[PDB]
Design a protein around this ligand. Structure first.
Ligand SMILES: O=c1c(O)c(-c2ccc(O)cc2O)oc2cc(O)cc(O)c12
Ligand SMILES: O=c1c(O)c(-c2ccc(O)cc2O)oc2cc(O)cc(O)c12
Ligand SMILES: [Cl-]
Ligand SMILES: [Cl-]
Ligand SMILES: [Cl-]
Ligand SMILES: [Cl-]
Lengths: 216, 216
């Protein structure tokens, strides 16, 4: 194939790219990298971060999942994943950047214990509540009646967050506390494109248990 | 005016917006906020971060300088500040995001001392060298023959970085160590649009001396 994806069977950032390519109907070869022994192609294609995902189109590389997503949207414009109105597009980019900035709040879930881990989980619930109230509102998806780049960017809050919660022994995304966001997470996971393209939960839980063990 | 900018006379992030609006020939009212007593409009328009800049167009707010810049480019498409080719646009977004991620390296310049501050400055030089070699290359500007959103996003490495260097007593962007980036910084500051729209250096230096005093 003319499109290659240097990926992973577990990274949520790689899954954002898989979803976008499948939504566009773009054929691609998935090259699963071993992060303990990175290939010559990965280091050549992404010299700045040496990380996956890396999309390679016509032999030219695009690194960083958020940059890859906008490249896919611009390259294959059919089945749009962003709105046409500039203000609506700015709101979508604003929420995507908000999610990208709050990564440190989720890290604390694998670094804190007891009366400190409860506080870290409460801080994550408040991050999600802002997203729920000001971002999702009463829509079925962040993209309205169907998923868009904003839903894709927040997909890591579904099975990956469920695995983090089970590995850390704390609750974050619950129906009592975040009713609309919890209903969104269920609806997103049930979209056939997402359902057919997510890691096996038991394998993902084992991976998150290892990451928590390393982060202590 | 139909375009308002809730700004500042010193923030480099606010100056990115001033430059973009002036490059588009967009008339606007500049509302300088007092950060020790934020207005009702600022808190209403930017509830998530409560920060400047905030662009208000037709009474609708757009916060975060990078989101504002793409909104300006999409709303006033004449005098383009991004290329048309999707791969070229992805490279521009990639470098803009790289600059946005390396903010912590610059923070160390106002938190470290002696044999630790020399190390922090060396780390900043390596961040800039990657940008110079892989981003700028042999072009006059990141946008080629004229400035684009990438040059605008890196404008904080000109007089603001010069002020940080003088306040901290360390050298970072020098011609001997970064020849092309130093020539770029001189060329950027000499562009008439930039020259006529930058803070007074003595006032900016006094501001950075205060920020370093607070950051210790
Ligand atoms: O930072 C995250 C992360 O690295 C990862 C992550 C998980 C598995 C993997 O193989 C790689 C990752 O970067 O997942 C997240 C999931 C979340 O719900 C929230 C997060 O902030 C992360
Ligand atoms: O983080 C910065 C910053 O907050 C600021 C900054 C300076 C003045 C001001 O009023 C507000 C700011 O955020 O300037 C920077 C300049 C640089 O060259 C590099 C930086 O990382 C910053
Ligand atoms: Cl990524
Ligand atoms: Cl992470
Ligand atoms: Cl900003
Ligand atoms: Cl900052």
């Amino acid at each position: 194939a003319d499109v290659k994806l240097h990926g992973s069977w577990v990274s949520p950032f790689n899954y954002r790219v898989i979803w976008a390519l499948k939504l566009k109907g773009v054929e691609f070869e998935h090259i699963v990298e071993d992060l303990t022994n990175k290939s010559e192609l990965l280091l050549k294609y992404n010299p700045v971060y040496k990380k996956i995902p890396v999309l390679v189109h016509g032999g030219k590389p695009i690194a960083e999942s958020l940059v890859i997503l906008e490249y896919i949207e611009e390259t294959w414009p059919e089945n749009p994943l962003l709105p046409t109105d500039p203000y609506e597009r700015a709101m979508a980019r604003f929420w995507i950047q908000y999610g990208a900035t709050k990564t440190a709040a989720f890290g604390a879930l694998f670094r804190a214990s007891g009366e400190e881990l409860e506080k870290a989980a409460k801080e994550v619930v408040e991050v999600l509540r802002v997203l729920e109230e000001q971002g999702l509102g009463d829509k079925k998806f962040f993209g309205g009646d169907s998923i868009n780049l904003v839903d894709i960017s927040f997909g890591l809050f579904t099975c990956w967050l469920e695995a983090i919660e089970e590995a850390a022994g704390v609750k974050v995304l619950e129906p009592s506390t975040l009713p609309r966001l919890h209903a969104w997470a269920q609806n997103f996971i049930e979209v056939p494109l997402i359902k057919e393209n997510i890691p096996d939960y038991d394998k993902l839980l084992l991976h998150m248990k290892g990451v928590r063990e390393k982060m202590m």
